[PDB]
Amino acid sequence: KTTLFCASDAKAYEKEVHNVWATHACVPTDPNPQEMVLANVTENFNMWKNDMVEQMHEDIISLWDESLKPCVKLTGGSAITQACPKVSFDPIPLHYCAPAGFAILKCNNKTFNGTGPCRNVSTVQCTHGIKPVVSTQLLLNGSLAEEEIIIRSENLTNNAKTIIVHLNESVNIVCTRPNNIRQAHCNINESKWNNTLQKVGEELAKHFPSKTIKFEPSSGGDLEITTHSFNCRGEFFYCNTSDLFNGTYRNGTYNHTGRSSNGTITLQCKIKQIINMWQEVGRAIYAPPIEGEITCNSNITGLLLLRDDTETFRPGGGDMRDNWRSELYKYKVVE
Numbered sequence: 001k002t003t004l005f006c007a008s009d010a011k012a013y014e015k016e017v018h019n020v021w022a023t024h025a026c027v028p029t030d031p032n033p034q035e036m037v038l039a040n041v042t043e044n045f046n047m048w049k050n051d052m053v054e055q056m057h058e059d060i061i062s063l064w065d066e067s068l069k070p071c072v073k074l075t076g077g078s079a080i081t082q083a084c085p086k087v088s089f090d091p092i093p094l095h096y097c098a099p100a101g102f103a104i105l106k107c108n109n110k111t112f113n114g115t116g117p118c119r120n121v122s123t124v125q126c127t128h129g130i131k132p133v134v135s136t137q138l139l140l141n142g143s144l145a146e147e148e149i150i151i152r153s154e155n156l157t158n159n160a161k162t163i164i165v166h167l168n169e170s171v172n173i174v175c176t177r178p179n180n181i182r183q184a185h186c187n188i189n190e191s192k193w194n195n196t197l198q199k200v201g202e203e204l205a206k207h208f209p210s211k212t213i214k215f216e217p218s219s220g221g222d223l224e225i226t227t228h229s230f231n232c233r234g235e236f237f238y239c240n241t242s243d244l245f246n247g248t249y250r251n252g253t254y255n256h257t258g259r260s261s262n263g264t265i266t267l268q269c270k271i272k273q274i275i276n277m278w279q280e281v282g283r284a285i286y287a288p289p290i291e292g293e294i295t296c297n298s299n300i301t302g303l304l305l306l307r308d309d310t311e312t313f314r315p316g317g318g319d320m321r322d323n324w325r326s327e328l329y330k331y332k333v334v335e
């Protein structure tokens with residue numbers, strides 16, 4: 001369509017990499033909110049062909065390649081070495097704004113599944129504040145569904161299409177490596193995981209009716225996708241989810257078949273140094289983990305699943321563009 005720019009709310013004094021990159025490439029955020037409503041102005045969206053997603057993907061790649069410089073980067077035959085200094089790392093919201101002569105349409109149907117027509121469409125200058133959170137399996141620190149859970153997918157009958165489950169009630173996940181230096185663990189509440197997976201199962205049954213829904217651990221692939229992986233305070237966490245995606249949904253009953261304990265599920269995690277880059281096909285070797293207790297307290301605001309007589313779903317991810325899509329679904333650049 002055109003070239004979108006970014007307005008952040010970053011502070012220049014901050015040594016945090018997100019703030020630095022933003023203040024160099026993002027303009028200041030406009031204080032007054034310019035929004036233009038419309039009642040019957042029907043319009044069509046396709047989150048899966050959105051170009052905003054591609055632009056933000058480019059900018060996030062530029063961020064990570066300017067901020068989390070690896071000790072070594074293996075791309076094909078090349079091996080590039082740089083300084084890999086540890087750095088303060090905490091995502092900051094970024095808004096994507098339409099330049100002059102261009103608008104951003106925003107679908108206001110609280111149940112829009114990302115494909116097709118929208119009843120209530122507004123006109124804005126900037127998207128809401130989006131946090132470029134890189135993760136797999138679980139979507140972290142996102143915005144929730146205002147009404148009920150939504151199931152987004154390009155083709156719900158194509159096993160290959162990644163399913164984005166968009167929740168309406170966040171679920172607390174706490175991950176920590178306290179004072180093996182790469183051993184860490186995560187805790188989630190078994191009761192709230194109950195409710196979340198049971199309601200996701202109800203919706204998934206709305207879409208797949210006869211068959212009984214099943215949640216199973218990640219089939220196979222690189223460690224970065226067979227586990228819930230993410231960056232926390234700087235370090236790369238890889239966490240096991242087999243005690244998380246592990247239940248069955250039959251006649252409105254979701255029985256969780258994962259190993260809980262005292263009411264909380266813990267996940268075993270390793271802090272790996274050889275990362276399989278999401279930006280491009282290559283590897284990145286980073287410096288050994290710092291000291292202190294590294295801990296992140298995150299919200300599970302979404303899921304990435306992949307289907308395969310009953311229907312079974314597994315944690316997926318890896319195309320970091322799906323993360324951006326999960327937030328830019330309700331937007332479209334126009335004019």
Ligand SMILES: N=C(N)NC[C@H]1Cc2cc(CN3CC[C@@H](N)C3)ccc2[C@@H]1NC(=O)C(=O)Nc1ccc(Cl)c(F)c1
Nearest residue numbers: 134135136224229230231276277278280281282318319
């Ligand atoms: N080749 C390489 N080195 N990267 C390719 C990317 C692109 C893609 C695409 C599919 C899609 N699948 C469907 C069809 C299949 N062909 C592939 C799966 C995995 C992947 C890979 N993503 C990752 O590696 C990744 O995200 N790492 C990572 C690192 C740090 C953190 Cl914090 C994190 F959270 C994650």
Ligand SMILES: *[C@@H]1O[C@H](CO)[C@@H](O)[C@H](O)[C@H]1NC(C)=O
Nearest residue numbers: 147148149168169199200203
């Ligand atoms: C969230 O979605 C579920 C399933 O669609 C629904 O039962 C619930 O009432 C919604 N709102 C919540 C949980 O606040």
Ligand SMILES: *[C@@H]1O[C@H](CO)[C@@H](O)[C@H](O)[C@H]1NC(C)=O
Nearest residue numbers: 113115116117152153155156
């Ligand atoms: C999304 O909703 C549209 C109608 O708005 C429908 O045509 C399409 O099949 C739906 N897709 C999914 C995966 O729910």
Ligand SMILES: *[C@@H]1O[C@H](CO)[C@@H](O)[C@H](O)[C@H]1NC(C)=O
Nearest residue numbers: 154155156157158159160161
């Ligand atoms: C999804 O793929 C199936 C075949 O795999 C076929 O119905 C069609 O190509 C797609 N359906 C829709 C509604 O786009």
Ligand SMILES: *[C@@H]1O[C@H](CO)[C@@H](O)[C@H](O)[C@H]1NC(C)=O
Nearest residue numbers: 190191194254255256262263
């Ligand atoms: C919900 O979580 C509680 C917490 O321990 C557990 O007792 C119960 O079995 C869970 N419910 C289901 C359906 O798994």
Ligand SMILES: *[C@@H]1O[C@H](CO)[C@@H](O)[C@H](O)[C@H]1NC(C)=O
Nearest residue numbers: 223226227239240241242243
């Ligand atoms: C997760 O844990 C199970 C058993 O605890 C193990 O069989 C599986 O290989 C683990 N997966 C990864 C990626 O470590």
Ligand SMILES: *[C@@H]1O[C@H](CO)[C@@H](O)[C@H](O)[C@H]1NC(C)=O
Nearest residue numbers: 216217242243246257258259
């Ligand atoms: C579910 O959890 C139990 C206990 O942690 C484990 O033995 C079992 O293999 C898990 N299910 C799957 C399908 O991995």
Ligand SMILES: *[C@@H]1O[C@H](CO)[C@@H](O)[C@H](O)[C@H]1NC(C)=O
Nearest residue numbers: 188189190191192262263264
């Ligand atoms: C979190 O788990 C504890 C037990 O582990 C439970 O008492 C509490 O009710 C859970 N949180 C919510 C919101 O239910």
Ligand SMILES: *[C@@H]1O[C@H](CO)[C@@H](O)[C@H](O)[C@H]1NC(C)=O
Nearest residue numbers: 091140141230231296297298
């Ligand atoms: C999510 O936000 C909280 C609050 O800023 C932060 O402590 C946590 O590290 C964030 N999680 C991720 C994965 O960025």
Ligand SMILES: *[C@@H]1O[C@H](CO)[C@@H](O)[C@H](O)[C@H]1NC(C)=O
Nearest residue numbers: 141170171172297298299300
């Ligand atoms: C989780 O979601 C709540 C919802 O209001 C939000 O206020 C909070 O900042 C989010 N993050 C954490 C770490 O609680």
